[PDB]
């Protein structure tokens, strides 16, 4: 129920943050790094597969961002729909009125 939606939005937000940081680092060091020291770990062994992995990153970040935003919007609409649907919430004068009506009909009939 609502707690499950809370948790789902939680991984939604953390996934946004993580993929944001990932695309940031990927595009910033998209310029390949060559360092003589053994400490650095950046490998570009096969030339064109580097571009393939780059477009990999592009497609992944696009799909994930769009899907997460769309899911959040659908979640908001579902909440609003639940809001709309689920929230469960003289005689005497008539006497002379009918008397005049019936006498008028009797006279007119």
């Amino acid at each position: 129920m609502s707690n499950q939606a809370l948790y789902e939005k939680l991984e939604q937000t953390r996934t946004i943050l993580s993929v944001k940081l990932a695309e940031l680092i990927n595009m910033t060091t998209i310029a390949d790094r060559n360092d003589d020291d053994e400490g650095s770990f950046a490998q570009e062994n096969s030339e064109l597969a580097v571009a393939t992995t780059s477009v990999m990153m592009v497609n992944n970040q696009t799909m994930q961002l769009i899907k997460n935003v769309q899911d959040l919007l659908i979640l908001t609409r579902s909440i609003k729909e639940k809001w709309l649907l689920n929230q469960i919430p003289d005689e005497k004068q008539i006497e002379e009125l009918l008397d005049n009506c019936i006498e008028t009909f009797v006279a007119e009939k």
Partner: protein
């Protein structure tokens, strides 16, 4: 019309998705600016910090407000009915019509 509480609830929700749209738009401008920043002109460098900060602060408080709404759902629990009176009101209006029929000076 609906009771007011639902009205400000829907206003807050509408603000929520408008904020989400603003976040997407600002993501578009930050992606745009990073391209020319990689190109090599440093004039728009100061704008980058402002755009990033506004993007993050737009991402955070929107989710916070939505969290507040979902929390409101938690304590809002416990807080044809019209048919039970429907015939009655129909009754009333019919007699009103008879009154208009009964008085010939009001049929103008």
């Amino acid at each position: 019309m609906q009771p007011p509480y639902i009205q400000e609830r829907l206003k807050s929700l509408n603000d929520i998705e408008t904020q989400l749209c603003s976040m997407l738009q600002e993501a578009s401008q930050v992606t745009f600016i990073f391209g020319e920043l990689k190109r090599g002109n440093e004039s728009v460098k100061p704008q980058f910090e402002n755009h990033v900060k506004q993007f993050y602060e737009r991402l955070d408080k929107s989710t916070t407000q939505l969290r507040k709404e979902i929390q409101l759902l938690d304590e809002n629990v416990g807080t044809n009915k019209k048919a039970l009176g429907q015939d009655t009101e129909k009754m009333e209006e019919q007699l009103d019509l008879l009154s208009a029929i009964l008085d010939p000076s009001k049929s103008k």
